[PDB]
């Protein structure tokens, strides 16, 4: 409808795939080459389905910060015959707060979904399903089941992926440029 949705659509149309594990279907953001991200609670194994194709997982790494605390991001390298558009230059370098964000989701259940979630707070510490977690972003939108892996954007920046909510508020793990230095 406007410039927020335009930037979000540009990311969804070229840099997402539908990932399916034993724990369900997730929006998965492709970042560069064959490297993508997914919430750690997706429990990625040796095999994953990508747009319903059986795919070997070449590597998977559940990130923690230097305090040894969960970040709820898993970086996955996919045995795929095709590279993602490199979007590392849209990633923020530091932890920050943001105005006017969009959460975008694409699964079987919720195709072509775009939610204007508004202002984003650097929340920091969250007990997320009983796991201490750092680098959490918070938005005052009642997000639901099926939205995990959703991409959080502003005009010009890809800032996080949706990892849960409490019924009133939604929560995303930060994406930083330093996670994807090759």
From Swiss-Prot:
<feature type="active site" description="For protease 3C activity">
    <location>
        <position position="72"/>
    </location>
</feature>
<feature type="active site" description="For protease 3C activity">
    <location>
        <position position="148"/>
    </location>
</feature>
<comment type="function">
    <text>Major viral protease that mediates proteolytic processing of the polyprotein. Cleaves host EIF5B, contributing to host translation shutoff. Also cleaves host PABPC1, contributing to host translation shutoff. Binds and inhibits host IFIH1/MDA5, thereby inhibiting the type-I IFN production and the establishment of the antiviral state. Cleaves host MAP3K7/TAK1, resulting in inhibition of TRAF6-triggered NF-kappa-B induction. Cleaves host TICAM1; this interaction allows the virus to disrupt host TLR3 signaling. Cleaves host IRF7, resulting in inhibition of type-I IFN production.</text>
</comment>
<comment type="subunit">
    <text>Interacts with host IFIH1/MDA5; this interaction inhibits host IFIH1.</text>
</comment>
<feature type="domain" description="Peptidase C3">
    <location>
        <begin position="2"/>
        <end position="180"/>
    </location>
</feature>
<feature type="active site" description="For protease 3C activity">
    <location>
        <position position="41"/>
    </location>
</feature>
<protein>
    <recommendedName>
        <fullName>Protease 3C</fullName>
    </recommendedName>
</protein>
């Amino acid at each position: 409808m406007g410039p927020g949705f335009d930037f979000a659509q540009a990311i969804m149309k070229k840099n997402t795939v539908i990932a399916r594990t034993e724990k369900g279907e997730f929006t998965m953001l492709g970042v560069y080459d064959r490297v993508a991200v997914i919430p750690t609670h997706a429990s990625v194994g040796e095999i994953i389905y990508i747009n319903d194709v059986e795919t070997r997982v070449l590597d998977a790494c559940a990130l923690r910060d230097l305090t040894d605390t969960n970040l709820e991001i898993t970086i996955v390298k996919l045995d795929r015959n095709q590279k993602f558009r490199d979007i590392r230059h849209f990633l923020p370098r530091c932890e920050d707060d943001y105005n006017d964000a969009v959460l975008s989701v694409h699964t079987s259940k919720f195709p072509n979904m775009y939610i204007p979630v508004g202002q984003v707070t650097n929340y920091g510490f969250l007990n997320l399903g009983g796991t201490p977690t750092h680098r959490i972003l918070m938005y005052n939108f009642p997000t639901r089941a099926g939205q995990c892996g959703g991409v959080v954007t502003t005009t010009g920046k890809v800032i996080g992926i949706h990892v849960g909510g409490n019924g009133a508020q939604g929560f995303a793990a930060m994406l930083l440029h330093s996670y994807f230095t090759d």
